[PDB]
Every structure is written in structure tokens, then in C-alpha cells.
Symmetry: none
């Protein structure tokens, strides 16, 4: 809570990734994937009191 | 809560990613994926008290 | 909580990965994978009191 | 909690991996794999009191 | 809790691995594997009191 | 808890492995393997009081 | 707990192995193997009081 | 607990092995093997009081 | 507990073995073998009070 530097929180979506490809190459993201549901990536330091759920996630067929 | 630097929170959508491709190359994002539902990426540090849910997410067919 | 440096938390989505490929090469992300559901990647240091669940995750067929 | 450096926590998604491939080569991510469900990668140092579960994860058929 | 350096915790997803391949070579990630469920990779030093379970993980058929 | 250096804990996913291959060579990850379930890789030094289980893990058929 | 150096704990996934192969060679990971279930690789020095179990692990058929 | 150097504990996954192969050669990991279940590789010096079991491990058929 | 140097404990997975092969040669890991179950490789010096068992380990058919 006190003195925070380089604070970066990310559940999905290339949190911290660069130079995926260079020159001739096929750059394709994740593709098929289901991210959280409800409190995806709990950020905002201080207090996180919640409740959620998910049952039926599908990506690409 | 006190002294915050480089504070960046992102659940999905390339949180911190650059130089995905260079020159000849096919740059394709994630493609098929379902992000949170309700409190996606809890930011705004201070307090996060909520409740949600989701059951029936589909991406591309 | 006091004095924080290089603080980076990421459950999925290439937390900290660079130079995946260079020049001629096929850069393909994860592909088929299901990330958390509810409190995916618990960040925001301070307190995390929640409850969730998920039973029915599918990626690519 | 006091004096933190090089603090990086990641359950999946190449936590800390670079130079996966160079020049002619096929760069393919994990492929088929199911990440946590509920409290995937418990970060945000301070306190983590939760409960979750998951029974029915599938990746690629 | 006091004085922390080079603190990096990762359950799966190449925790700390670089130079997987160089030049002509086939770079393939794990492939088929199921990561934790519930409290995957317990990070955020301070206290981790939770409970979870999972019975039905499948990767690639 | 006091004075910590080179602290890196990883259950699976090449904890600390580099230079897997060089030049002409087939770089293939683990392949078929099931990681923990519940409290995979107990990190965050301080206290870890939990309970979990898993019976039905399969990787590649 | 006091004065810690070169502290690295890893149950599976090449804890500390480099230069697996060089030049012409087939680099293949473990292949078929099931890692712990519940408290895989008990890290986070301080206290580890838990209970778990697993009966039904399979890797590759 | 006091003054710790070169502290590295690993149950499986090449704890401390390098230069597995050089030049023309077939580098194959363990292959078929089942790692612990429950408290695989008890690390985090300080105290480890738990209980677990496993009866039904199979690797490759 | 006091003054520890070159402390490395590993039950399986080439604890401390290097230069397995050089140049033309077939580098094959253990192959078929079942590692502990429950408290595999009791590390974390300080105290280890647990109980476990396993009856039904198979590697490769």
C-alpha cells in the first residue's frame, strides 16, 4: 500500500510480452481461450471482497 | 494507496505487449476468447465489494 | 505492503515473455486453454477474501 | 511485506521465459492446457482467504 | 516478509526458462497438460488459508 | 522470512532451465503431464494452511 | 528463515537443468509423467500445514 | 534456518543436471514416470506438517 | 540449521549429474520409474512430521 513501483497486474492478454515475432513470421494471438468470469484479475490494491462463478465457457466451437 | 508508480492493471486485451510483428507477417489478435463478466479487471484501488456471475460465453461459433 | 519494486503478477497470457520468435518462424500463442474463473490472478495486495468456482471450460472443440 | 524487489508471480502463460526461438523455427505456445479456476495464481501479498473448485476442464477436444 | 530479492514464484508455464531453441529448430511448448485448480501457485507472501479441489482435467482428447 | 535472495519456487514448467536446444534440433516441452490441483507450488512465504485433492487427471488421451 | 541465498525449490519441470542439447539433436522434455496433486512442491518457508491426495493420474494413454 | 547458501531442493525433473547431450545426439527426458502426490518435494524450511496419499499412478499406457 | 553451504537435496530426477553424453550418442533419461508419493524428498530443514502411502505405481505399461 505504501511505496509502489513497477506495479502491473494482468490475468490474460499478454500481460508483459513484446517482440512476439520479427520479419517473415505468422503472429497469432492465444486463439481459443476463456478468461475469468466475475472478478477477473483482482487489482486495485486495498481490499477485494466478492464472490462469483461461471460454468459454460467455450472458445471456437 | 500511498505513492503509486507504473500502476497498470489489465485483465485482457494485450495488457502490456508491443512489437507483436515486424515487416512481412500476419498480425492476428487473440481471435476467439471470452473476457470476464460483471467485475472484469477490478481496478480503482480503495475497495471492491461486489458479486456477479456468467454461464454461457461463446466466441466464434 | 511497504516498499514494492518490480511487482508484476499475471496468471496467464505470457506474464513475462519476450522474443518469442525472430525472422522466419511461426509465432503461435497458447492456442487452446481455459484461464481461471472468478478470482483469476489475485492481485491488488492488501486483502483478498472471496469464493468462486467453474465446471465446464472448453477451448477449441 | 517489507522491502520487496524483483517480485513476480505467475501460475501459467510463460511466467518468465524469453528467446523461445530464433530464426527458422516453429514457435508454438503451450497448446492444450487448462489453467486454475477460482483463485488462479494467488498474488497481492497481504492475505488470501478464499475457496473454490473446478471439475470439467478440457483443452482441444 | 522482510528484505526480499529475486522473488519469483511460478507453478507452470516455463517459470524461468530462456533460449528454448536457436535457429533451425521446432519450438513446441508443453503441449498437453493440466495446471492446478483453485489456488494454483500460492503467491502473495503473508498468509494463504484456502481450500479447493478438481477431478476431471483433460488436455488434448 | 528475513533477508531473502535468489528466491525462486516453481513446481512445474521448467522452473530454472535454459538452452534447451541450439541450432538444428527439435525442441519439445514436457508433452503429456498433469500438474498439481488446489495448492500447486505453495509459495508466498509466511504461512500456508489449506486442503485439496484431485483424482482424474489425464494428458493426451 | 534468516539469511537466505540461492534458495530455489522445484518438484518437477527441470528444476535446475541447462544445456539439454546442442546443435543436431532431438530435445524432448519428460514426455509422460504426473506431477503432485494438492501441495505440489511445498515452498514459501515459514509453515506448511495442509492435507491432500490423488488416485487416478495418467499421462499419454 | 540461519545462514543458508546454495539451498536447492528438487524431488524430480532434473534437480541439478546440465550438459545432457552435445552435438549429434538424442536428448530424451525421463519419459514415463510418476512424481509424488500431495506434498511432493517438501521445501520452505520452517515446518512441514501434512498428510496425503496416492494409489493409481500411470505413465504412458 | 546454522551455517549451511552447498545444501542440495533431491530424491529423483538426476539430483547432481552433468555431462550425461557428448557428441554422437543417445541420451535417454531414466525411462520407466515411479517416484515417491506424499512426502517425496523431505526438504525444508526444520521439522517434517507427516504420513502418507502409495500402492499402485506403474511406469510404461
Amino acid at each position: 500500500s505504501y511505496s509502489g513501483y513497477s506495479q502491473s497486474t494482468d490475468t490474460s492478454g499478454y500481460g508483459q510480452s513484446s517482440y512476439s515475432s520479427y520479419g517473415q513470421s505468422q503472429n497469432t494471438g492465444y486463439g481459443t481461450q476463456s478468461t475469468p468470469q466475475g472478478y477477473g484479475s483482482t487489482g486495485g490494491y486495498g481490499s477485494s471482497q466478492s464472490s462469483q462463478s461461471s460454468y459454460g465457457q467455450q472458445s471456437s466451437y
